[PDB]
C-alpha cells in the first residue's frame with residue numbers, strides 16, 4: 001500500500017535463453033547506466049502499447065508478444081509523484097536492435113549483467129526476472145544512487 | 159551487518175485468529191507481541207523458541223516452522239538483534255498467563271497494530287500469506303522506524 005498519485009512508466013527486457021538485451025542511456029536522466037527500454041506512458045495508449053512504443057523508439061525492435069513480469073513503485077525523496085513502473089518481458093523479437101539518440105543496445109550473457117553500472121534496484125529484482133517469478137517491488141531512493149528502503153515479494157497476479 | 163545477538167519470536171497462527179501476549183513488565187512493556195526472547199548458549203534457535211513459548215504461554219508444540227529473519231538496529235545501541243521468527247498452527251494445551259506474558263487471541267481482522275511494535279504492520283502481511291521473509295528495521299527509540307527493507311525469500 002503506497003498512497004498518492006503515481007505516474008505510469010514501462011520497462012521492457014528482451015530476455016532470451018542465454019542472453020539479455022540492455023541499452024546504454026546516452027542522454028538525459030540516468031545517462032551512463034545500462035537499462036531496459038522504457039519511459040512514460042502517454043495519454044491515449046494502453047500500458048502495453050506504451051511499452052511497445054518505447055522499445056521501438058529506443059532500439060528499433062518490434063515484438064510479437066510482451067509479458068507482464070512485475071510492477072515496481074519508486075519514491076524519490078522530495079519528489080511528490082510516485083512512479084508506477086510496469087515491467088515486461090519478451091524472448092522473441094523482430095529485427096536487429098539499432099542505436100538511437102537515447103540508447104545504445106548490446107546483448108549480455110546472463111552471468112555478465114553489469115549490475116554496478118545499472119540502476120541499484122536492478123540487483124534486487126533482476127534475479128526474479130531471470131527465474132521467471134512475477135513480483136511487486138517498492139524502492140525509496142535519495143537521489144540516483146541510494147536506496148533508503150525497499151520491499152520485494154512474489155505475486156500470482158502482476 | 160556487524161556484531162549481533164540471537165532472538166526468537168513465535169506466532170501461534172490459526173485460520174481465524176492469532177495468539178499474542180501482553181508484555182507485563184521490563185523491555186517493551188505495554189505492547190502486544192509474539193512470544194520469545196534471547197537464545198541461550200548451548201541451545202538451538204528453534205529450541206530457544208520452544209523454550210520461550212512454554213515459559214511465556216504454557217504451550218508446547220508439535221512443529222515450529224521458520225517464517226523469517228528480521229535484523230533490528232537501534233540508534234545508539236551498538237549490537238544488532240538477529241530475530242528468527244517462527245510460526246505454528248497446531249498446539250498442545252490451553253495458553254495460560256505467566257509472569258512475563260498474558261496471552262489473548264485476536265481475530266485476524268482485529269490485530270492491535272497500534273499497540274504493537276511498529277515493524278509488525280510491515281511484515282505481518284507476509285506472515286498471514288504464509289510467505290517467508292528477511293527483514294531489516296532501523297529504529298530511533300521505541301516508536302520510530304527510520305528505514306527498513308523486507309524481501310520475500312524461499313529459505314529463511
Ligand SMILES: O=c1[nH]cc(-c2ccccc2-c2ccccc2)c(=O)[nH]1
Pocket residue numbers: 009010011030035036037038039040083085119121122
Ligand atoms: O531499472 C531501472 N530502474 C529505475 C529506473 C528509473 C529510475 C529513476 C527514474 C526513472 C526510472 C525509469 C525510467 C524509465 C522506465 C522505468 C524507470 C530505470 O530507468 N531503470
Ligand SMILES: O=c1[nH]cc(-c2ccccc2-c2ccccc2)c(=O)[nH]1
Pocket residue numbers: 165166167186191192194195196230239241275277278
Ligand atoms: O514484533 C516485534 N518486533 C520487535 C520486537 C523487539 C523490539 C525491540 C527490542 C527487542 C524486540 C524483540 C524482543 C524479543 C524478541 C524479538 C524481538 C519485538 O519484541 N516484537
